[PDB]
Write a protein that binds this DNA or RNA. Structure first.
Ligand SMILES: [Mg+2]
Lengths: 172, 29, 70
RNA sequence: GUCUCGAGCCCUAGACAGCCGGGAGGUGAGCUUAGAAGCAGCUACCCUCUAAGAAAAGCGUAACAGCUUACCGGCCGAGGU
């Protein structure tokens, strides 16, 4: 099969072997797209994903490559934004961005700060009780957002009573 | 060609003398 | 403004309570001219254009109560 | 998991899925009941407006409300089941 993806005017994309770099006004994203007998190339103004094989496994990845490239197109133009809200019951939770990592202090009354590192060119902006995770790479942004929610994971006690934590409010 | 679609085209042709695809089918008539 | 259908039937019938099983147990009775009086009153309540179809909506409560038409 | 073969049905008069929009009135059916208004129970399950819309399929409420299912319309476009 062969699927042709038309590149937007804001965007310009180059290809080096199996790696595809996608540049735009919001940034640049380089992804490696490697799978048996699937050739991904740039035909001037279109990105072509093709294969001689049409089996269920090849078709699975052609559709995955399509969505990855379309996502990179959206990332370098409009960007990717995940909105998060910080909820606390008894203990005042201090969420702050210290360097290239987001630190959470005094969670459930803990003396020790919980922290996670931000993935790549992702920017995390805090406005009091609201947090917005943004960037061009959906892989990096989606993870950094997830990492913040996963950072307040509680396995020891009941999650229904101890609901403190930063949760994903908006998904793009 | 379902029988309800044929009877619906005949109902729309009746109200032109006196789905968007069924209106277009009736307009061509 | 105008009172419900269930109440307007009980005024020109003489009976208050309905039945446990409708059509199988006949309670009240209405005539042809008695349904034409209830059709005149409900104009903003009903969505019908003609006076003929306005009567059919009142009958849609009658036979499902125990009211026979003669 | 994947490959191959057969059968039935649906489909450019636009299928399958998704998303948007509509999901209206008589009337909150009646009985039961302090109340019960799709949705405790019993019985019935009728007709208007219309392109659809149950006397309501599933949650939800003390009862309402609120959320959607059926059903109809739009966007989309090729196979789908
Ligand atoms: Mg324990």
């Amino acid at each position: 099969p062969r699927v042709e993806l038309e590149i937007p005017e804001d965007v310009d994309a180059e290809q080096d072997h199996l790696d595809i770099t996608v540049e735009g006004d919001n940034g640049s994203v380089t992804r490696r797209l490697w799978y048996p007998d699937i050739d991904v190339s740039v035909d001037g103004d279109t990105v072509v994903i093709e294969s001689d094989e049409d089996n269920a496994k090849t078709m699975s990845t052609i559709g995955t490559f399509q969505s990855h490239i379309e996502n990179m197109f959206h990332g370098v133009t409009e960007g990717w934004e995940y909105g998060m809200e910080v909820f606390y019951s008894h203990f005042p939770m201090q969420v702050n961005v210290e360097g290239d990592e987001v630190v959470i202090e005094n969670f459930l009354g803990e003396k020790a700060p919980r922290r996670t590192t931000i993935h790549g060119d992702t920017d995390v902006e805090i406005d009091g009780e609201e947090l917005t995770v943004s960037g061009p790479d959906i892989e990096a942004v989606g993870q950094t957002a997830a990492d913040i929610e996963q950072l307040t994971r509680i396995n020891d006690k009941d999650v229904r009573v101890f609901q403190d934590g930063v949760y994903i409010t908006r998904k793009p | 060609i379902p029988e309800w679609k044929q009877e619906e085209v005949d109902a729309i042709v009746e109200m032109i003398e006196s789905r968007n695809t069924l209106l277009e089918r009736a307009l061509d008539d | 403004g105008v009172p419900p259908t269930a109440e307007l039937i009980k005024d020109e019938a003489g009976f208050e309570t309905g039945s446990g099983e409708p059509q199988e147990d006949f309670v009240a009775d209405l005539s042809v001219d008695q349904v034409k009086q209830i059709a005149e009153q409900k104009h903003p309540d009903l969505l019908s254009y003609d006076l003929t179809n306005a009567a059919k909506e009142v009958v849609g409560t009658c036979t499902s109560l125990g009211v026979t038409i003669e």
